Amino acid sequence: MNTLDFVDQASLRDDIPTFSPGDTVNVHVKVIEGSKERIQVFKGVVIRRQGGGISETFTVRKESYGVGVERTFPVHSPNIDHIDVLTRGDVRRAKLYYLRELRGKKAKIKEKR
Amino acid sequence: PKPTKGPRLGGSSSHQSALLANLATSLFEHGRIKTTEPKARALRPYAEKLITHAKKGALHNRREVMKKIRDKDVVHTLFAEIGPFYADRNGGYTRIIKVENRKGDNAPMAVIELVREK
Amino acid sequence: HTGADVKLYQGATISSTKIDGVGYPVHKPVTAGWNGYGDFQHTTEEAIRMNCRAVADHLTRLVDAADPEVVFVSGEVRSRTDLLSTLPQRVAVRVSQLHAGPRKSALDEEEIWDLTSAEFTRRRY
């Protein structure tokens, strides 16, 4: 029952959608550049999710100009102000590390039907 | 259950797994066997998790018992007698009694017994 | 590192000197002895150091007497940077290191002139 869950309760966040590894999402992140706050979008497949409660993280994978980029966030991080789930994928794994050696038409993931 | 802390009990990780299945088969057939004390201590959690499968006796629970004890005459006894018998007890189906040492090598031996008090 | 030879130029006159060495076996053979007992490491380093000290003393005497402006030194990587570390700061500041061949070949006046012209050009600039 997570002996410290009476401390982690206050810092949890609502309105996180219900996503699973294999789903395609775009994550709205806040960046600071000379005290001017703006927002950037990272769009890619979700390849893992390491549950721990308040300390849960997930990883998003993208290909940018022929170079792949992985970006990992905490689920309840205040920086992530918005998550939109775009597609639900068909996977037989809980962690999709096998995508790391696949490029192009070989890295496409089926979707729920 | 909880894995062994130190070196395994028979000499390797595969001799202990086959040693526990043979000890539980002989515990459910006679009801009382006399073994070395560290062998009886490690058998208590192992044998009690098989009676629980027989208490909630279905086809699914039966086929998970069959993948350990392998003796078809003992699977029948688990589900016909030892399952319904303990239907009114919430755990603690086994008792361990300490007895005299062995003469040859001074090993501490003990008796492990099924509870029949109800 | 078995000796040296020196030429001093004061214009019309040329003076030559041959510095000889006192440590004869300047070569260290591979053999050492029975199980390495006895070894010609230190007893050859000391001979080479004796030769370097003799050459340095003679060159310092020449520098104190004639006051040259440049002291060209022609040798190899080993017996030209350890003699430069033996000379005092008086002369080591005015040393230009050359890259010439063995002493048995000997040099002519034209070759020496061509060797030193490149340095004298920069010096006069």
Binding site: E33, Y65, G66, V69, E70, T72, S77, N79 | - | -
Partner: protein, 122 residues
């Protein structure tokens, strides 16, 4: 996690393809170099008709690493390949074009000219 005897790719248009790491600047006995950390390297591959020639001794900066790097907010950044950009003394690129994305940490280390030419600053 880039050290001596380590090979990186070049993300410029200077004509270099591979460089070998030689030293990590920033203090004696330093061990690793991350994104935004200057190194000293030598050119191992080149194009026949380029500026930098094979065997040169150059300075460079690291823009991508395979090792994940933790940020101040608990997030992480990871790539598939180590890449470098050759610079000059004023910490300006020798080339003119930058290929692929670069990390955001170059903004902190005041590489303002490299960030402008980068197609994407993740």
């Amino acid at each position: 996690m880039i050290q001596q005897e380590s090979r990186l790719k070049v993300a410029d248009n200077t004509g270099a393809k591979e460089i070998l790491c030689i030293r990590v600047l920033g203090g004696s006995s330093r061990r690793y170099a991350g994104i935004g950390d200057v190194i000293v390297a030598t050119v191992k591959d080149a194009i026949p008709g380029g500026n930098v020639k094979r065997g040169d001794v150059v300075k460079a900066v690291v823009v991508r690493t395979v090792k994940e790097r933790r940020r101040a907010d608990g997030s992480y950044i990871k790539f598939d390949e180590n890449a470098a950009v050759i610079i000059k003394n004023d910490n300006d690129p020798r080339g003119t074009r930058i290929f692929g994305p670069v990390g955001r940490e170059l903004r902190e280390k005041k590489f303002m000219k490299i960030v402008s030419l980068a197609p994407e600053v993740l």
